[PDB]
Every structure is written in structure tokens, then in C-alpha cells.
Structure 1
Amino acid sequence: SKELRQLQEDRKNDKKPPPYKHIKVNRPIGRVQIFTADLSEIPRCNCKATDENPCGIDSECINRMLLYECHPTVCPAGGRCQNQCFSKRQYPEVEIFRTLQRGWGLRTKTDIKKGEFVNEYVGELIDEEECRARIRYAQEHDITNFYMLTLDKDRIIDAGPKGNYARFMNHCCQPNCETQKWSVNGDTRVGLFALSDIKAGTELTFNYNLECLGNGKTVCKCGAPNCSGFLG
């Protein structure tokens, strides 16, 4: 109970989170590269411009089904294509709030429908050498908040120093969002998507699936009845 009493006090006193730079797109650091592909490598889906909601959430779209974003100059549905979520950056409105046991969190200001694009997990894109250095620094300074998610081998998104609102989304063993790795313009991106209808005011969470680098020993405080005890 000793730690809880302190947490009650902290929640009262903590007016704002530590500063970070709010950015729109991933920022490669050092020798990290972002890759591109020729347009010939972007798939054309099965949607037609005459369909009710071409390439939409509820459509038959194979690109959406395989986690490929359509390209606007290529998609058979043309300007009616509803599968350009990462590039268009239309996110549901959200706000940061202070939790008791899980630091700062994020809650939605609007209703969100099952399958809707919620956010892109954006940050600095760093290599293993840089990740280890940052994790070691944090550990040496008793920092227990990590914002690192692997994109692929030797390319890690660190939303700590620079990121967007997705950096505030906490882990839950019964979450209402999930990460998905998509191919956008010939390279990988990490999106957050709603698992169910979510009501305005609700905290947005996802299952970290042990991907948050540095949290491998962390005890989960999500409070779900099916809690694994860890961030995954």
C-alpha cells in the first residue's frame, strides 16, 4: 500500500508530462534508412469506383486485407479510394490524461468504430546500437518509461524524444486497439486500429505483445481479469 499512497500524491501533483517534440512522420537517425519502391510494386486491388465505399473498412479490398495502403495514382477506385489512412493522417481526436498506476495515458474525445484507423506510431527511427545506448541511459537514471517499438531488424521506432499522440497509449491485456504493420509506398509503417467500437472518453490501449523494448521485466498494472502480469 506504501507505493499506492505515493502514486495517489504523484497523480495530484503531476500537471503535465515531460516535454517531447510532436512530429508527423518517422525521423531516421544515423545510418538508418527509409526505403522506397517503384510504383510498379504497389498492388492494384479488386475494388471498383462504383462500389459503395471503395477500399473502405467494410469493403472486399485485398490491399486493405493484406495491410497494403493503396497509392492514389494507381488504385482502380481513383479518388474514391478509402485506403490511404497513413498518408492522409486523419486521426480521431484524442487527449492526454494522468492515470494512477500507468503514468500518462491517452483517451479519445470521439466515438471510434471497429476497424477504424486510430493513429500511426511515429518517432525517431534508430538502430540497435542507439537503442541499447538509450535503454542503458534510462536504466542508469531510474527511468522506467520506454517508447521503443521494432519496425524491423535494426530499425526501431523511439517515440520518446520525438513522437505523436500514440506515444501515450498504455498496454492492456484486454485492449481496445491493436498495432498492425502495413506496407506504405514500399516501406513498413506501424498503425493502431480499433478492435471494437470505442466510446468518447475511453482510454485507448493496445497489447504491447512484449514489443516495448526495455519493459521485458515490467509488471502489468492493466487490471484486466485475464492479465498476463507482463506487457504482452
Structure 2
Amino acid sequence: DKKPPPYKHIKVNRPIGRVQIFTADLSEIPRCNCKATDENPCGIDSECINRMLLYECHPTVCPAGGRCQNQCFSKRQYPEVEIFRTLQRGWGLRTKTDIKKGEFVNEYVGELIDEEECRARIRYAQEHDITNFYMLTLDKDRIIDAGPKGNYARFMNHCCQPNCETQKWSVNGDTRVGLFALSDIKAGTELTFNYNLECLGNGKTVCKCGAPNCSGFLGV
């Protein structure tokens, strides 16, 4: 209870076994029409077509060059966060800097596994009386398991009225799960999101989010 159980802090998703990882030729990556002279080229308020489709601008082709603000996953531009111990929800994540509405908070990084491996790892965890799951569905047949290996995003708890959301983006021709702010978040505030249908294994865990509209479940 002094420190969270050991995990491998990794920078990017790690395929495991028979999980495939797509990658894109420039042919397959869209090109925006921002200009280097725009106020915040490819920025959150811009009309960047790439941004609007949840695509990163690729740096070798973005007409805004080095000023492009649409590479938040690639450059890993995470606001400063600290792991803290909550009351009833185990370990939590909070921000040490102010975050503006819509700003990129983090990527949910971990091991990529299939239905069979995810089932296996859930069975093992139950038999050992484990209630902490880090499984988040990437697409129809791949699951992020931030349990063994992950980054700071793995400590973000569920809340039924959250202050961040997940968004599925395309980066170098593959899906990445991003956390983005639903509103302005003041420094020291806990970063949560609604698990909705995306997280697995939580089953009958009783929600302790403390939100007025709390369903008593972690999404489902």
C-alpha cells in the first residue's frame, strides 16, 4: 500500500503474440490545408481536416511544418501528473498543471492482446482475488492491457460525471486511445473518465466516483 504494485512504465503500445499492428504509407494518411501563418496552425481551435477526423498531421507533409500543433501522440506532450492514493478507489491520477478544455491529457498505453489472452488474464486475476483491471478495447479484436506494462494513464479511475474522455485517433496508420479534457481542470484535481462500454473485467465492482448521477457501476 506504500507504492502501487510494480509495472513496466512504457512509452508506446506493445503487440503480444498473434496481435497485428498496422502502419501507414503516406498514400494512406490525409493531408490538411492549414498554413504555417495561421494563428495556431493545426491547433485545437483550427479547421484542420486531420484534427477533425482524429488524425495526426504527419510531420514530413503537414503544410504548417514545425508549427503544426496536431502531433500530440507522436511528441507525447502530456501535462505534468502525479500518482496519489484515493479514499475508496485505490491509486488515482491527478494533474500538477492547469489543463484547458479539449487539451490532450494522455494516451492509454499498454500491451495489445486478443479476446483469448484477455480472457486468460482476467481468469488468473479473479482466482488470485484481484479487482484492478487495465483492459480497454482498441477495436473489434484488440484490447489494451495497461496492467503489466503501461504509463500514467493506467491510474485514471472511472467517474460517472468525468472531467476527461477517450477519443480513438489514427497515428502512423493505427488506432491509439487518447484522453482529452471535457472542461478546464485546475491543478491538483483528479483526472477521471467514464469507462462506458470500453473497459473489461470490472463486472460487479461498485462505483465510488462520488458523482451526483452515479449509476453504481463502472460504465456497465
For normalisation by structure 1, the TM-score amounts to 0.92
Asked if structure 2 preserves the Cα contact closer than 8 Å seen for 1:210 and 1:216, the reply is no
Q: Distance in 2 between matches of 1:58 and 1:230?
A: 35
Shift of 1:90: 1.4
**Residues 41-80 of structure 1 aligned to structure 2 (within 5 Å):** 41-80=28-67
The Cα offsets for residues 161-183 of structure 1, whole Å up to 9 and x where unpaired, read as 00000000000011110100001
Shift of 1:52: 0.4
In terms of fraction of residues, the more helix-rich structure is: 1
The Cα offsets for residues 114-164 of structure 1, whole Å up to 9 and x where unpaired, read as 111100000011111110000000111110000000111221100000000
Q: Distance in 1 between matches of 2:199 and 2:124?
A: 16
Shift of 1:217: 2.1
For normalisation by structure 2, the TM-score amounts to 0.97
Shift of 1:40: 1.2
Shift of 1:209: 0.6
Asked if structure 2 preserves the Cα contact closer than 8 Å seen for 1:68 and 1:184, the reply is yes
More divergent stretch after superposition (217-226 vs 187-196): 217-226
Residues paired across the two proteins, number? 219
What SS does the corresponding residue of 2:179 show, helix, strand or coil?
strand
Kindly report structure 1 stretches of 4+ aligned residues shifted beyond 3 Å. none
Q: Distance in 2 between matches of 1:125 and 1:220?
A: 26
- What is the Cα-based RMSD across aligned positions, in Å? 0.9
What SS does the corresponding residue of 1:179 show, helix, strand or coil?
strand
Structure 1 spans left out of the alignment, 5+ residues: 1-13
Q: Distance in 2 between matches of 1:54 and 1:168?
A: 32
Asked if structure 2 preserves the Cα contact closer than 8 Å seen for 1:170 and 1:204, the reply is yes
Shift of 1:216: 2.7
Q: Distance in 1 between matches of 2:205 and 2:33?
A: 44
Shift of 1:45: 1.2
Shift of 1:77: 1.1
Shift of 1:88: 0.3
